[PDB]
Amino acid sequence: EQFQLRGVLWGKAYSWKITGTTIDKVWSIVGDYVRVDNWVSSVVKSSHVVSGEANQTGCVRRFVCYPASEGESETVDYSELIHMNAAAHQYMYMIVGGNITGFSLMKNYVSNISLSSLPEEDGGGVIFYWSFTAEPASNLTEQKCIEIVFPLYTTALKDLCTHLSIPESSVTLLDD
Amino acid sequence: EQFQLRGVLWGKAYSWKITGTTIDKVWSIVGDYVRVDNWVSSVVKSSHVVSGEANQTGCVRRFVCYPASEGESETVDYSELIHMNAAAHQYMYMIVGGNITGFSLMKNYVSNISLSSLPEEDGGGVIFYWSFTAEPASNLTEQKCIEIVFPLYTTALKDLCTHLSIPESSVTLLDD
Numbered sequence: 001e002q003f004q005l006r007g008v009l010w011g012k013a014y015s016w017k018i019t020g021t022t023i024d025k026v027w028s029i030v031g032d033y034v035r036v037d038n039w040v041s042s043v044v045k046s047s048h049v050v051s052g053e054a055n056q057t058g059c060v061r062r063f064v065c066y067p068a069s070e071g072e073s074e075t076v077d078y079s080e081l082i083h084m085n086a087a088a089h090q091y092m093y094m095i096v097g098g099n100i101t102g103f104s105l106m107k108n109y110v111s112n113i114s115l116s117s118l119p120e121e122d123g124g125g126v127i128f129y130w131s132f133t134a135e136p137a138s139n140l141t142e143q144k145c146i147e148i149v150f151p152l153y154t155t156a157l158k159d160l161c162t163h164l165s166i167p168e169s170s171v172t173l174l175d176d
Numbered sequence: 177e178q179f180q181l182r183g184v185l186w187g188k189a190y191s192w193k194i195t196g197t198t199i200d201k202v203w204s205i206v207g208d209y210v211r212v213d214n215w216v217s218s219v220v221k222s223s224h225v226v227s228g229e230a231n232q233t234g235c236v237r238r239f240v241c242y243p244a245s246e247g248e249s250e251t252v253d254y255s256e257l258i259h260m261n262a263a264a265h266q267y268m269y270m271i272v273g274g275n276i277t278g279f280s281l282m283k284n285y286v287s288n289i290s291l292s293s294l295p296e297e298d299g300g301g302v303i304f305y306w307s308f309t310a311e312p313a314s315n316l317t318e319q320k321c322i323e324i325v326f327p328l329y330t331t332a333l334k335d336l337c338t339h340l341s342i343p344e345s346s347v348t349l350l351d352d
């Protein structure tokens with residue numbers, strides 16, 4: 001009959017329905033964690049594993065982002081895979097270093113990606129779940145976090161369509 | 177150009193499609209965090225807020241579970257709401273005390289619930305997302321965690337149907 005209080009978190013979860021593809025085609029792009037340059041190509045220039053075994057839990061990827069706007073420099077993200085279940089199409093990662101624009105402002109940014117199949121008997125389709133949390137910090141606000149994260153996720157879903165060779169109309173953000 | 181390694185996590189995410197209901201109806205049961213006795217009523221005997229304000233971020237619920245078997249005592253869960261966004265039908269909580277069977281064995285059990293509406297042109301329906309993580313510890317394995325958690329989530333989806341007065345066939349586990 002005792003408990004230990006802890007601090008609250010910031011964050012938000014998003015889900016999209018994607019038609020016209022399959023979960024394992026989506027996963028071939030989205031699940032190749034250390035090669036995120038092959039996914040979010042509107043943002044990421046290059047990417048490679050720098051610690052551990054590629055796409056195995058505990059590994060760290062380092063990726064380079066194009067300048068956020070002209071005149072700016074390239075920035076770098078280090079992120080650690082902290083959970084991976086490839087057969088269940090889901091994983092979890094955290095930013096552990098770098099100066100990547102916006103994202104490096106957050107304290108303990110953790111993200112979850114989980115792909116699910118809608119029932120074949122209902123016409124199929126893929127649900128793409130993507131969430132983040134961050135720890136509240138004096139130098140930021142939850143609204144700022146969401147302003148940083150959501151445009152990136154939106155860009156990434158667009159880039160996904162490009163790499164799957166399906167129209168952008170294939171993706172629909174679900175009402176929460 | 178440096179980074180610090182962090183520990184990895186155990187866990188799993190699950191998604192169900194629920195037909196014959198609306199996100200508002202589901203939320204009226206699932207979203208009443210401190211009254212989980214009015215949701216998972218086959219497992220939970222009673223539930224009350226014991227710190228903070230009911231269903232506001234930071235609050236702690238105390239709930240009591242029926243005995244696992246005859247002669248066994250009731251067990252107790254303390255869990256803190258660490259994120260709540262009711263407008264977006266999503267929240268996150270962690271066990272912060274108690275001796276609730278199985279769940280109290282995990283180190284830093286954290287759970288996320290999200291509800292999404294499928295497009296009306298598709299026939300509507302709700303996607304129910306539910307995930308957990310726990311920290312690796314000597315006295316458990318990830319498999320043992322999954323064997324604690326998934327049967328409870330399954331029971332909870334069944335109990336949800338009872339309270340919604342809809343048949344269990346309304347619920348389909350995605351990727352079953």
Ligand SMILES: N#C[C@H](O)c1ccccc1
Nearest residue numbers: 040043077079095111152
């Ligand atoms: N780490 C991390 C972020 O989620 C991220 C940022 C840019 C492109 C892909 C992913």
Ligand SMILES: N#C[C@H](O)c1ccccc1
Nearest residue numbers: 216219253255271287328
């Ligand atoms: N806290 C917590 C667990 O997720 C839980 C355990 C039993 C019934 C409802 C919820």
